[PDB]
Amino acid sequence: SAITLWQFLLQLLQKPQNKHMICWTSNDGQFKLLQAEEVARLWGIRKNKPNMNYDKLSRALRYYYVKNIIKKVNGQKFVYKFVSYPEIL
Amino acid sequence: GKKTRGRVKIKMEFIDNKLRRYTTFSKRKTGIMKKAYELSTLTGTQVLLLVASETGHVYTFATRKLQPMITSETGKALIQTCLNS
Amino acid sequence: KKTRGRVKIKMEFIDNKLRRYTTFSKRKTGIMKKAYELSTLTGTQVLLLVASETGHVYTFATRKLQPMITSETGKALIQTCLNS
DNA sequence: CACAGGATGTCCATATTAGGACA
DNA sequence: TGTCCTAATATGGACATCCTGTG
């Protein structure tokens, strides 16, 4: 059950059933958290972290910034992107 | 396999990664201060610990009699003098 | 089975003159080991000063903080603290 | 809000310590 | 101090939790 956010997030971006919650906003990696708080809800269920929310999840995302995995997209709300896509796969 | 790699052994040299280093600095400083207290109280002895953050914060633990060394004017200037040359 | 293992002792001043000492010497080598690991790994200034009941003072001080225990202004303030 | 970045805590799993007893 | 045996911890890695600050 060893999983990391970026893995989990991607796992959501490969399931169509999750398109109006989280969806690709481009073909070269960028994606958007349409229903941000929900993803958080689920991600806190995947890690068994009940009180999880976007204000905590995003913080993990921001840590990914310097770790060169996921960068924000200035301007576009809830939009992020993998930097080594589609390499990450 | 297991959920995490668990605690992993590291080379005892300088940490080039600004984040792994920063994280490690907290984790340790969190424990060393603990030891100081323990030793201090466990064997009832004076102990002065003084850790200076890579940024600027100066964490410190000091038993009563030593307190006057991070609380006194001279100490403060002395500690302060010891960090800009 | 063989040895009882590391006993979880209470964080209160040991009363057995002997044990105490035995602990003191071990934790000391250990904590100093730490001040070195912390110092080294993160490359941050660190000062450690421990003084036994005898009054023997032990110290660890990274390059920069050395003055804190070498200079007369410092070596003074110290002797001064271990008093009443 | 939505986003940045900092200090400190948490959980898993394993790398390091250090109480006893004895040299 | 120097080991041995053995349980008690400290703590890497990966976030989780709070928080201060900002347009």
Resolution (A): 3.2
C-chain CB neighbours of B78 within 8 Å are 67-68, 73-74, 77
For the CA atoms of B54, B55, B56, B60, the dihedral, rounded to the nearest 10 degrees, stands at -50
Report the domain count for chain B.
1
The interaxial angle of helices C72-81 and B73-81, nearest 10 deg, is 140
B56 is a domain residue: yes
Give the technique used to solve this structure: X-ray
**Cα angle B20, C68, C31; round to 5:** 50
State which residues between 17 and 76 of chain B bring their CB within 7 Å of strand D: 22-23, 26-27, 29-30, 35, 38, 42, 53, 55, 57, 59
Structural domain span for residue C20: 16-84
C-chain CB neighbours of B71 within 8 Å are none
The rounded distance, in Å, linking the Cα atoms of A81 and A25 is 9
For the CA atoms of C40, C41, C47, C53, the dihedral, rounded to the nearest 10 degrees, stands at -90
A87 with A11: CB under 8 angstroms?
no
Q: Determine A/B contact with 3+ CB pairs under 8 A as the test.
A: yes
For residue C10, is it left (φ>0), alpha (ψ between -120 and 50) or beta? beta
A61 with A52: CB under 8 angstroms?
no
The rounded distance, in Å, linking the Cα atoms of A83 and A70 is 6
B12 is a domain residue: no
The interaxial angle of helices A5-12 and A54-66, nearest 10 deg, is 110
Q: What is the largest CA-CA distance in chain B?
A: 56
Is some CB atom of chain B closer than 8 A to the CB atom of C65? yes
Measuring from the CA of residue C5 to each C1' atom, give the nucleotide at the shortest distance: E6
C6 is a domain residue: no
C22 is a domain residue: yes
| CATH number of the domain where residue C21 is located | 3.40.1810.10
The interaxial angle of helices A5-12 and A36-46, nearest 10 deg, is 120
